[PDB]
Coordinates of C-alpha atoms and ligand atoms in Angstrom, one line a residue:
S1 CA 106.8 66.4 101.9
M2 CA 105.7 68.7 99.0
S3 CA 105.5 72.4 100.1
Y4 CA 102.4 72.7 97.8
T5 CA 100.0 70.3 96.0
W6 CA 97.8 71.9 93.3
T7 CA 94.4 70.8 91.9
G8 CA 95.0 73.1 89.0
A9 CA 92.2 75.5 90.0
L10 CA 93.5 78.9 88.8
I11 CA 94.4 81.5 91.5
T12 CA 91.6 83.9 90.8
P13 CA 92.0 87.6 91.5
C14 CA 89.6 90.2 93.1
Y15 CA 104.2 97.2 84.6
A16 CA 102.3 95.5 87.5
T17 CA 102.6 91.6 88.0
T18 CA 99.0 90.3 87.4
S19 CA 97.2 86.9 88.1
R20 CA 98.6 85.3 84.7
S21 CA 102.2 85.3 86.0
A22 CA 101.1 83.5 89.2
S23 CA 101.6 80.0 87.5
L24 CA 105.4 80.6 87.1
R25 CA 105.7 81.4 90.8
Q26 CA 103.7 78.1 91.6
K27 CA 106.4 76.0 89.8
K28 CA 109.2 77.7 91.8
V29 CA 107.5 77.4 95.3
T30 CA 106.6 73.6 94.8
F31 CA 109.1 70.9 95.8
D32 CA 109.8 68.2 98.4
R33 CA 112.0 69.3 101.4
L34 CA 115.0 67.4 102.7
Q35 CA 116.1 68.3 106.3
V36 CA 118.9 66.8 108.4
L37 CA 119.5 68.2 111.9
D38 CA 122.6 68.0 114.1
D39 CA 124.1 68.8 117.5
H40 CA 124.7 72.5 116.6
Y41 CA 121.0 72.9 115.7
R42 CA 119.9 71.1 118.9
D43 CA 122.3 73.2 121.1
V44 CA 121.1 76.6 119.6
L45 CA 117.5 75.4 120.0
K46 CA 118.0 74.5 123.6
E47 CA 119.7 77.9 124.3
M48 CA 116.8 79.7 122.5
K49 CA 114.2 77.7 124.6
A50 CA 116.1 78.6 127.8
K51 CA 115.7 82.4 127.0
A52 CA 112.0 81.8 125.9
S53 CA 111.3 80.3 129.4
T54 CA 111.8 83.8 130.9
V55 CA 108.7 85.1 129.0
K56 CA 105.1 85.6 130.4
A57 CA 102.5 86.3 127.7
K58 CA 99.0 87.8 128.2
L59 CA 95.9 86.6 126.5
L60 CA 94.3 89.5 124.6
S61 CA 90.5 90.3 124.7
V62 CA 88.1 90.0 121.7
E63 CA 87.9 93.8 121.9
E64 CA 91.8 94.2 122.1
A65 CA 92.4 91.9 119.1
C66 CA 89.8 93.8 117.0
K67 CA 91.4 97.1 117.5
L68 CA 94.6 95.8 116.0
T69 CA 92.9 94.9 112.6
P70 CA 93.6 97.1 109.5
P71 CA 90.4 98.6 108.1
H72 CA 91.4 97.4 104.6
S73 CA 91.8 93.8 106.0
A74 CA 90.1 91.1 103.9
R75 CA 86.4 90.7 104.7
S76 CA 85.3 87.5 106.4
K77 CA 83.7 84.8 104.1
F78 CA 80.9 85.0 106.9
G79 CA 79.3 88.3 106.1
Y80 CA 81.4 90.9 108.0
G81 CA 84.7 92.7 107.3
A82 CA 87.3 94.8 109.1
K83 CA 85.1 97.9 109.8
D84 CA 82.5 95.6 111.5
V85 CA 85.4 94.0 113.6
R86 CA 87.0 97.4 114.4
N87 CA 83.6 98.7 115.4
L88 CA 82.9 95.5 117.4
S89 CA 79.7 94.5 115.6
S90 CA 77.6 91.7 117.3
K91 CA 77.9 89.6 114.0
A92 CA 81.8 89.9 113.9
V93 CA 82.3 89.5 117.7
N94 CA 80.0 86.5 118.0
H95 CA 81.7 84.8 115.1
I96 CA 85.2 85.4 116.6
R97 CA 84.0 83.9 119.9
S98 CA 82.7 80.8 118.1
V99 CA 86.1 80.4 116.1
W100 CA 88.0 80.7 119.5
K101 CA 85.7 78.1 121.1
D102 CA 86.3 75.8 118.1
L103 CA 90.0 76.3 118.4
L104 CA 89.8 75.4 122.2
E105 CA 87.7 72.3 121.5
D106 CA 88.8 70.9 118.0
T107 CA 92.4 70.0 117.9
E108 CA 92.9 68.2 114.5
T109 CA 90.6 69.7 111.7
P110 CA 92.5 71.8 109.1
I111 CA 91.5 75.5 108.9
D112 CA 90.8 76.8 105.4
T113 CA 93.2 79.4 103.9
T114 CA 92.6 81.7 100.9
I115 CA 95.4 81.8 98.3
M116 CA 95.9 85.0 96.3
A117 CA 98.3 86.9 94.2
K118 CA 100.0 90.1 95.4
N119 CA 100.0 92.7 92.5
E120 CA 103.3 94.5 93.1
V121 CA 104.3 97.2 90.7
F122 CA 107.9 96.7 89.4
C123 CA 109.9 98.4 86.6
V124 CA 109.6 97.4 82.9
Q125 CA 113.1 95.9 82.4
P126 CA 113.5 94.6 78.8
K127 CA 109.2 88.6 87.8
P128 CA 106.3 86.1 88.7
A129 CA 103.5 87.4 91.1
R130 CA 104.0 86.8 94.9
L131 CA 101.5 84.5 96.7
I132 CA 99.6 85.4 99.8
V133 CA 98.0 82.6 101.9
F134 CA 95.7 83.8 104.7
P135 CA 92.9 82.4 107.0
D136 CA 89.5 84.0 107.5
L137 CA 89.2 87.3 109.4
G138 CA 87.7 85.6 112.5
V139 CA 90.6 83.1 112.7
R140 CA 93.1 86.1 112.2
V141 CA 91.5 87.9 115.2
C142 CA 91.8 84.7 117.3
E143 CA 95.5 84.4 116.2
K144 CA 96.0 87.9 117.8
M145 CA 94.2 86.9 121.1
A146 CA 96.5 83.9 121.5
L147 CA 99.8 85.0 120.1
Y148 CA 100.0 88.9 119.7
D149 CA 101.7 89.2 123.2
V150 CA 104.0 86.2 122.3
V151 CA 105.2 87.6 118.9
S152 CA 105.6 91.1 120.6
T153 CA 107.8 90.0 123.6
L154 CA 109.3 86.5 122.8
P155 CA 111.6 87.4 119.8
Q156 CA 113.6 90.1 121.6
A157 CA 113.8 87.8 124.7
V158 CA 115.3 84.9 122.6
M159 CA 117.5 86.8 120.1
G160 CA 118.2 90.0 121.9
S161 CA 120.0 92.5 119.6
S162 CA 119.8 90.0 116.7
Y163 CA 116.0 90.6 116.5
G164 CA 115.8 92.7 113.4
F165 CA 112.3 94.2 113.8
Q166 CA 113.1 96.0 117.0
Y167 CA 115.0 98.9 115.4
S168 CA 114.0 102.3 114.1
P169 CA 116.0 103.0 110.8
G170 CA 118.5 105.1 112.8
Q171 CA 118.9 102.4 115.5
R172 CA 119.5 99.6 112.9
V173 CA 122.3 101.7 111.3
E174 CA 123.8 102.5 114.8
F175 CA 123.7 98.7 115.6
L176 CA 125.4 97.8 112.3
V177 CA 128.0 100.5 112.5
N178 CA 128.9 99.6 116.1
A179 CA 129.1 95.9 115.2
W180 CA 131.5 96.5 112.3
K181 CA 133.7 98.8 114.6
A182 CA 133.7 96.1 117.3
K183 CA 135.6 93.6 115.1
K184 CA 139.5 93.9 114.8
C185 CA 139.2 93.2 111.1
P186 CA 135.6 92.8 110.0
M187 CA 134.0 90.6 107.3
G188 CA 130.3 90.6 106.6
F189 CA 127.7 88.9 104.4
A190 CA 124.0 88.6 103.5
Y191 CA 122.4 85.2 103.2
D192 CA 119.3 85.1 101.1
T193 CA 117.2 81.9 101.2
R194 CA 115.6 80.5 98.0
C195 CA 111.8 80.4 98.7
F196 CA 112.2 80.7 102.6
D197 CA 108.4 80.2 103.3
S198 CA 108.4 77.0 101.1
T199 CA 111.7 75.6 102.7
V200 CA 109.9 75.9 106.1
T201 CA 109.1 72.3 106.9
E202 CA 106.3 71.1 109.2
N203 CA 109.0 70.1 111.8
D204 CA 110.3 73.8 111.7
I205 CA 106.8 74.9 112.6
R206 CA 106.5 72.4 115.5
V207 CA 110.0 73.5 116.7
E208 CA 108.7 77.1 116.6
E209 CA 105.7 76.1 118.7
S210 CA 108.1 74.4 121.2
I211 CA 109.6 77.8 121.7
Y212 CA 106.2 79.5 122.2
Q213 CA 105.3 76.7 124.7
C214 CA 108.2 77.9 127.0
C215 CA 106.2 81.1 127.8
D216 CA 104.0 81.5 130.9
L217 CA 100.7 81.0 128.9
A218 CA 97.1 81.0 129.9
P219 CA 95.5 77.5 129.4
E220 CA 93.3 78.9 126.6
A221 CA 96.3 80.7 125.0
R222 CA 98.3 77.3 125.3
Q223 CA 95.5 75.3 123.6
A224 CA 94.9 78.0 121.0
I225 CA 98.7 77.8 120.1
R226 CA 98.4 73.9 120.0
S227 CA 95.3 73.8 117.8
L228 CA 96.5 76.7 115.5
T229 CA 99.9 74.9 114.9
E230 CA 98.2 71.6 113.8
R231 CA 95.1 73.0 112.1
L232 CA 96.6 76.1 110.5
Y233 CA 100.4 76.7 110.8
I234 CA 101.8 73.2 109.7
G235 CA 99.5 73.4 106.6
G236 CA 96.0 73.0 105.2
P237 CA 93.7 73.3 102.2
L238 CA 94.1 76.2 99.7
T239 CA 91.0 78.0 98.4
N240 CA 91.0 80.7 95.6
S241 CA 89.3 84.2 95.9
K242 CA 86.2 82.6 94.1
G243 CA 85.9 79.7 96.7
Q244 CA 87.2 76.8 94.6
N245 CA 89.8 74.4 96.2
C246 CA 93.3 75.1 94.8
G247 CA 95.2 72.4 96.7
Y248 CA 97.2 71.9 99.9
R249 CA 100.0 73.6 101.7
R250 CA 102.7 71.9 103.9
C251 CA 104.9 75.0 104.5
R252 CA 104.7 78.6 105.9
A253 CA 101.5 80.6 105.2
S254 CA 102.5 84.3 104.4
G255 CA 99.2 85.8 105.8
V256 CA 99.5 84.4 109.4
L257 CA 100.4 86.4 112.5
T258 CA 103.4 84.1 113.3
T259 CA 105.0 84.5 109.8
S260 CA 107.7 87.2 110.6
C261 CA 108.2 85.9 114.1
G262 CA 108.4 82.2 113.1
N263 CA 110.5 83.0 110.0
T264 CA 112.8 85.2 112.3
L265 CA 113.1 82.5 114.9
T266 CA 113.7 79.7 112.4
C267 CA 116.2 81.6 110.2
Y268 CA 118.0 82.7 113.4
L269 CA 118.0 79.0 114.7
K270 CA 119.4 77.6 111.4
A271 CA 121.9 80.5 110.9
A272 CA 123.4 80.5 114.4
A273 CA 123.8 76.6 114.2
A274 CA 125.4 77.1 110.7
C275 CA 127.8 79.7 112.2
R276 CA 129.0 77.0 114.6
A277 CA 129.2 74.4 111.8
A278 CA 131.3 76.9 109.6
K279 CA 133.4 77.9 112.7
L280 CA 132.8 81.6 111.9
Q281 CA 134.7 83.7 114.5
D282 CA 132.9 86.3 116.7
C283 CA 129.6 86.6 114.8
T284 CA 127.1 89.4 115.1
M285 CA 123.8 88.4 113.5
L286 CA 120.9 90.6 112.4
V287 CA 117.7 88.7 111.4
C288 CA 114.6 90.2 109.6
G289 CA 112.4 87.1 108.8
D290 CA 114.0 85.2 105.9
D291 CA 116.7 88.0 105.6
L292 CA 119.9 87.6 107.5
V293 CA 123.3 89.5 107.8
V294 CA 126.4 88.3 109.6
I295 CA 129.2 90.6 110.8
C296 CA 132.1 88.3 112.0
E297 CA 135.9 88.4 112.4
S298 CA 137.8 88.0 109.1
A299 CA 140.3 85.1 108.8
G300 CA 141.6 86.0 105.3
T301 CA 139.8 86.2 101.9
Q302 CA 140.4 82.4 101.0
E303 CA 139.5 81.1 104.4
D304 CA 136.4 83.5 104.5
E305 CA 135.3 82.0 101.1
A306 CA 135.8 78.5 102.6
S307 CA 133.9 79.4 105.8
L308 CA 131.0 80.7 103.8
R309 CA 130.6 77.5 101.7
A310 CA 130.5 75.5 105.0
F311 CA 127.9 78.0 106.2
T312 CA 125.8 77.4 103.0
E313 CA 126.2 73.6 103.2
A314 CA 124.9 73.6 106.9
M315 CA 122.0 76.0 105.9
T316 CA 121.2 73.7 103.0
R317 CA 121.2 70.6 105.3
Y318 CA 118.8 72.6 107.6
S319 CA 116.4 73.0 104.6
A320 CA 117.4 76.7 104.0
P321 CA 119.4 76.6 100.6
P322 CA 120.5 80.0 99.2
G323 CA 119.0 82.0 96.3
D324 CA 122.3 83.6 95.4
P325 CA 125.5 82.2 97.1
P326 CA 126.8 84.7 99.7
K327 CA 129.8 86.9 99.0
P328 CA 132.1 88.0 101.8
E329 CA 132.3 91.8 102.0
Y330 CA 135.0 93.9 103.7
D331 CA 133.1 97.3 103.6
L332 CA 129.9 97.7 105.6
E333 CA 128.6 99.9 102.7
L334 CA 129.0 96.9 100.3
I335 CA 126.5 94.6 102.0
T336 CA 123.0 94.5 100.4
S337 CA 120.1 93.2 102.6
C338 CA 116.4 94.1 102.3
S339 CA 117.3 95.7 99.0
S340 CA 119.2 98.2 101.1
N341 CA 122.7 99.4 101.7
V342 CA 124.5 101.6 104.3
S343 CA 125.7 104.9 103.0
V344 CA 127.2 108.0 104.6
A345 CA 126.7 111.9 104.5
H346 CA 127.4 114.9 106.8
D347 CA 125.0 116.7 109.1
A348 CA 124.8 120.6 109.3
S349 CA 128.0 120.6 111.4
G350 CA 130.1 118.3 109.1
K351 CA 129.8 115.3 111.3
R352 CA 129.5 111.8 109.6
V353 CA 126.0 110.3 109.5
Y354 CA 125.3 106.7 108.3
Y355 CA 121.9 105.9 106.8
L356 CA 120.1 103.2 104.8
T357 CA 119.5 103.7 101.1
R358 CA 118.6 101.6 98.0
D359 CA 118.3 101.8 94.3
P360 CA 115.4 104.3 93.7
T361 CA 114.0 102.6 90.5
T362 CA 111.3 100.5 92.2
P363 CA 110.2 103.1 94.8
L364 CA 109.9 105.7 92.0
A365 CA 108.1 103.3 89.5
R366 CA 105.7 102.3 92.3
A367 CA 105.1 106.0 93.3
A368 CA 104.5 106.7 89.6
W369 CA 101.9 103.9 89.5
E370 CA 100.3 105.2 92.7
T371 CA 100.0 108.8 91.4
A372 CA 98.1 107.5 88.4
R373 CA 95.7 104.9 90.0
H374 CA 94.2 105.5 93.5
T375 CA 95.7 102.8 95.9
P376 CA 94.3 101.9 99.3
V377 CA 97.8 101.2 100.9
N378 CA 100.5 103.2 99.2
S379 CA 104.3 102.7 99.1
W380 CA 105.5 106.3 98.5
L381 CA 104.7 107.4 102.1
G382 CA 106.3 104.3 103.5
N383 CA 109.4 105.0 101.4
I384 CA 109.3 108.7 102.6
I385 CA 109.3 107.4 106.3
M386 CA 111.9 104.5 105.6
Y387 CA 114.3 106.5 103.4
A388 CA 113.8 110.1 104.8
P389 CA 117.7 110.7 104.9
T390 CA 118.2 109.7 101.3
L391 CA 118.8 112.2 98.4
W392 CA 115.9 110.7 96.3
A393 CA 113.2 110.5 98.9
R394 CA 113.9 114.2 99.9
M395 CA 114.2 115.7 96.4
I396 CA 111.8 113.6 94.4
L397 CA 109.3 111.8 96.7
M398 CA 108.8 114.6 99.4
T399 CA 108.6 117.4 96.7
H400 CA 106.2 115.5 94.3
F401 CA 103.7 114.4 96.9
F402 CA 103.8 117.6 99.0
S403 CA 102.9 119.6 95.8
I404 CA 100.1 117.1 95.2
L405 CA 98.7 117.2 98.8
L406 CA 99.0 121.1 98.7
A407 CA 96.7 121.1 95.4
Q408 CA 94.2 118.5 96.7
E409 CA 94.2 120.4 100.1
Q410 CA 94.7 116.9 101.8
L411 CA 97.8 117.5 104.1
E412 CA 95.6 116.7 107.1
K413 CA 94.1 113.5 105.6
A414 CA 95.6 110.3 107.2
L415 CA 96.8 107.8 104.7
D416 CA 97.5 104.1 104.9
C417 CA 101.0 102.9 103.9
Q418 CA 103.0 99.7 104.1
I419 CA 106.7 99.5 105.3
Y420 CA 107.9 96.0 104.4
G421 CA 104.5 94.4 104.8
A422 CA 103.5 96.4 107.9
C423 CA 100.4 98.7 107.7
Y424 CA 100.6 102.3 109.1
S425 CA 98.1 105.2 109.2
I426 CA 99.9 108.5 108.9
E427 CA 98.9 112.2 108.5
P428 CA 101.6 113.6 106.1
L429 CA 101.7 116.7 108.4
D430 CA 103.3 114.5 111.1
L431 CA 106.2 113.4 108.9
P432 CA 108.9 115.9 110.5
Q433 CA 108.2 114.5 114.0
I434 CA 108.1 110.9 112.6
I435 CA 111.4 111.4 110.8
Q436 CA 113.1 113.1 113.8
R437 CA 112.1 110.2 116.0
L438 CA 113.1 107.4 113.5
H439 CA 116.3 109.1 112.1
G440 CA 117.2 112.2 114.2
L441 CA 117.3 116.0 113.4
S442 CA 120.3 115.3 111.0
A443 CA 117.8 113.8 108.4
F444 CA 116.7 117.4 107.7
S445 CA 120.2 118.7 107.1
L446 CA 122.2 115.9 105.4
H447 CA 124.5 116.9 102.5
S448 CA 127.9 115.8 101.0
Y449 CA 126.3 112.7 99.6
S450 CA 128.6 110.1 98.1
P451 CA 129.4 110.4 94.3
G452 CA 128.1 106.8 94.0
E453 CA 124.7 107.7 95.5
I454 CA 124.4 110.9 93.5
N455 CA 125.2 109.1 90.3
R456 CA 122.7 106.2 91.0
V457 CA 120.0 108.7 91.7
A458 CA 120.9 110.9 88.6
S459 CA 121.2 107.8 86.2
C460 CA 117.9 106.4 87.6
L461 CA 116.0 109.6 86.8
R462 CA 117.3 109.6 83.2
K463 CA 116.3 105.9 82.9
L464 CA 112.7 106.6 84.2
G465 CA 112.3 110.0 82.3
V466 CA 111.9 112.0 85.5
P467 CA 112.9 115.7 85.4
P468 CA 116.5 116.2 86.8
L469 CA 117.6 117.2 90.3
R470 CA 117.8 120.9 89.5
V471 CA 114.0 120.8 88.5
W472 CA 113.2 119.3 91.9
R473 CA 115.1 122.0 93.8
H474 CA 113.1 124.6 91.9
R475 CA 109.7 122.9 92.6
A476 CA 110.6 122.3 96.3
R477 CA 111.1 126.1 96.8
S478 CA 107.4 126.7 95.8
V479 CA 106.2 123.9 98.0
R480 CA 108.3 125.1 100.9
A481 CA 107.0 128.7 100.5
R482 CA 103.4 127.5 100.3
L483 CA 103.6 125.2 103.3
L484 CA 105.5 128.0 105.3
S485 CA 102.6 130.4 104.6
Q486 CA 100.2 128.0 106.3
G487 CA 101.7 127.7 109.8
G488 CA 101.5 124.9 112.2
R489 CA 102.6 121.4 111.2
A490 CA 102.4 122.6 107.4
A491 CA 105.0 125.2 108.1
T492 CA 107.1 122.7 110.0
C493 CA 106.8 120.4 106.9
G494 CA 108.2 123.3 104.8
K495 CA 110.9 124.3 107.2
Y496 CA 112.3 120.8 108.1
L497 CA 111.5 118.7 105.1
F498 CA 112.6 121.2 102.4
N499 CA 115.6 123.0 104.0
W500 CA 117.8 121.3 101.4
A501 CA 116.1 123.5 98.7
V502 CA 117.0 126.9 100.3
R503 CA 120.1 128.9 99.2
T504 CA 121.3 129.8 102.7
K505 CA 120.1 127.1 105.2
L506 CA 118.2 127.7 108.5
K507 CA 119.3 126.4 111.9
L508 CA 116.9 123.5 112.8
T509 CA 115.9 123.0 116.4
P510 CA 114.2 119.8 117.8
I511 CA 110.5 119.7 117.1
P512 CA 108.9 119.7 120.7
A513 CA 105.8 117.8 119.6
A514 CA 108.0 114.8 118.5
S515 CA 108.5 113.7 122.1
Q516 CA 104.7 113.5 122.7
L517 CA 104.4 110.9 119.9
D518 CA 104.0 107.3 121.1
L519 CA 105.8 104.9 118.6
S520 CA 105.7 101.8 120.9
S521 CA 103.9 99.5 118.4
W522 CA 106.2 100.3 115.5
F523 CA 109.0 98.5 117.4
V524 CA 106.9 95.8 119.2
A525 CA 105.2 94.9 115.8
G526 CA 107.6 95.8 112.9
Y527 CA 107.0 92.4 111.1
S528 CA 106.7 91.9 107.2
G529 CA 103.1 90.5 107.9
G530 CA 100.8 89.8 110.8
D531 CA 97.6 91.7 109.8
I532 CA 98.7 94.3 112.4
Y533 CA 97.5 97.9 112.1
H534 CA 99.8 100.5 113.7
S535 CA 98.2 103.9 114.0
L536 CA 99.5 107.3 115.3
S537 CA 98.7 108.6 118.8
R538 CA 100.4 111.3 121.0
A539 CA 100.3 111.2 124.9
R540 CA 98.9 114.7 126.1
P541 CA 99.4 117.5 123.4
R542 CA 100.6 120.9 124.8
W543 CA 98.1 123.6 124.0
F544 CA 100.6 125.8 121.9
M545 CA 101.0 122.9 119.4
Ligands
23E1 O1 116.7 119.8 81.7 C1 115.9 120.7 82.2 O2 116.2 121.9 82.5 C2 114.5 120.4 82.4 C3 113.9 119.2 82.1 C4 112.6 118.7 82.4 C5 112.2 117.4 82.0 C6 110.9 116.9 82.3 C7 110.0 117.7 82.9 N1 108.7 117.1 83.2 C8 107.5 117.7 83.5 O3 107.4 118.9 83.7 C9 106.3 116.7 83.4 N2 106.4 115.6 84.4 C10 107.1 115.7 85.5 O4 107.5 116.7 86.0 C11 107.4 114.4 86.2 C12 107.3 114.3 87.6 C13 107.5 113.1 88.3 C14 107.6 111.9 87.6 C15 107.7 110.5 88.0 C16 107.5 110.0 89.4 C17 108.6 110.4 90.3 C18 108.4 109.8 91.7 C19 107.0 110.1 92.3 C20 106.0 109.7 91.3 C21 106.2 110.3 89.9 C22 107.9 109.8 86.8 N3 107.9 110.7 85.7 C23 107.7 112.0 86.2 C24 107.6 113.2 85.5 C25 108.1 110.3 84.3 C26 106.8 109.6 84.0 O5 106.0 110.0 83.2 N4 106.5 108.4 84.7 C27 107.4 107.7 85.6 C28 107.5 106.3 85.5 C29 108.3 105.6 86.3 C30 109.0 106.3 87.3 C31 108.9 107.6 87.4 C32 108.1 108.4 86.6 C33 105.0 117.5 83.7 C34 104.6 118.1 82.3 C35 105.5 117.4 81.3 C36 106.1 116.2 82.0 C37 110.3 119.0 83.3 C38 111.6 119.5 83.1
8XJ2 C1 119.2 91.9 108.0 N1 118.7 93.1 107.3 C2 118.5 94.2 107.9 O1 118.5 94.4 109.1 C3 118.3 95.4 106.9 C4 119.2 96.0 106.2 C5 120.7 95.8 105.9 C6 121.3 96.2 104.8 C7 122.6 96.2 104.6 C8 123.4 95.7 105.6 F1 124.7 95.8 105.5 C9 122.9 95.2 106.8 C10 121.5 95.3 107.0 O2 118.7 97.1 105.4 C11 117.4 97.1 105.8 C12 116.4 98.1 105.4 C13 115.2 98.0 105.9 C14 114.8 97.0 106.8 C15 113.5 97.1 107.6 C16 113.2 98.3 108.3 C17 112.0 98.4 109.0 C18 111.6 99.7 109.6 O3 112.5 100.5 109.9 N2 110.3 100.0 109.7 C19 109.8 101.2 110.4 C20 110.1 101.1 111.9 N3 110.4 99.9 112.4 C21 110.6 99.9 113.7 C22 110.5 101.0 114.6 C23 110.1 102.1 114.0 N4 109.9 102.3 112.6 C24 109.9 102.6 109.7 C25 108.6 101.9 110.0 C26 111.1 97.3 109.0 C27 111.4 96.2 108.3 C28 112.6 96.1 107.5 C29 112.7 94.8 106.7 C30 115.8 96.1 107.2 F2 115.4 95.2 108.1 C31 117.1 96.1 106.7

């Protein structure tokens, strides 16, 4: 069937890719899907289901679900919105309860979804706007009641170490490095699917439900999953921001709770089956939704090229064709997944340290847009957290925004940021502890960066007309000195975040308050969607902090 059917009703909104480039994206994401399954697919599916069987999932309370809603979450087309939900207002709560009852009692009627354009700031290179399909706020809260515990527990149970969203940046790197080292002679590749959400057939979505149905579920939770699959997840009518009917969807909705989970499960299912079809030897897989990386045992350049075509043919048969055809790589540092690559530096004692990086052009262009126009959910803070070990995040991002926060006297003001579609509320003052927990103390004392990484950062600054690295070193020294002079977490920010800027470096000891921090949710909800709000809370602060 067609992934989408359009009535021609324009996708109405509320360089930066606007609502006029949304028509180009529509042509790409619209096509009929061909899917042919085989024994490999059925075997992996059965193996997956067997692991799912071990799971027991709890049914969340109205109250529990509400508290997981981001405060910037799209207001209900029923006269309430996010704040009302988060504060458990009689209007919001009573509507959620009705939605839930309707899900328990109505099993066929399609649930309406709103189609919109995501306005992402990219660089002016001399790309069509990404689409966002999501149900009403009330439905989104019910989704959480029924499947939050499933999506939190199930994926790790089924895929183990292959589940991509269970890792802190440091952990992911450690997994990757260990996997590459484990192989006698390793080969690795990244498989990018062309329009993954669109390639997701209605059968894929029912196969996904068959996995959820292996949990020990409450009868209400079971029916909710059943109704949500038929009425919402397999498809339904599309409605623009104005309320006019846009068309119909018969593929994955980006704005649903089961998007990263389902996409992960599906991608994994298809890929693992394709690994068998291509007879790839001793595969280690890492799956982050539509994004996948395979670290297997090399069998020679020509055979590796051959294996990979077989892999692609199988994936294509499973209705998961590639965007770009995969290239076999023989250096871990040469694989690019989630716009990222593994790089290496030295800690304060000269020991090797691997870390994830990326081309800084987009992060910097977006941060530049964000400094100009006030944004509710910023990328710069997410990039600071995600790329804390990187040369560019440390010298340009940390320096620029700490000087700004210093001026505006807003270091203590919690901000909302997105880290690959996930929403987090962070006080910039908590960055050292956050960084220490996600990357380790070495993030604060990395040096001896590769020439390649230094040159990419340098070139990129010239390209964007950003002052050079020597300017940033100078500016960071003022910021450091100012933050130090303020004590507490501010001085910690100066000491730890800006040690790179000082002539003769300080010995850095573990931040004691970093252990108090509870980061549970970050791991158990790392998904590139879900309408999940991860905040920051610390179990019992010691008085002297
Ligand atoms: O060779 C030497 O010895 C010295 C050279 C030198 C060159 C330029 C300066 N620039 C400045 O002082 C000013 N801007 C900046 O000091 C500046 C800071 C951050 C900038 C950023 C981003 C960096 C990441 C966080 C957000 C801000 C961009 N641009 C920046 C400019 C240049 C700009 O204007 N816009 C963009 C556009 C796209 C991408 C980046 C930028 C302020 C007054 C005049 C312009 C200073 C010294
Ligand atoms: C198969 N692709 C991957 O696994 C990823 C690769 C990759 C490149 C080369 C290569 F050779 C192999 C692999 O690079 C990435 C960069 C980034 C991400 C990534 C990281 C986080 C994330 O860390 N989010 C936080 C967090 N999460 C959990 C716990 C705590 N904190 C900071 C908030 C969340 C989502 C994503 C998409 C990724 F998956 C990947």
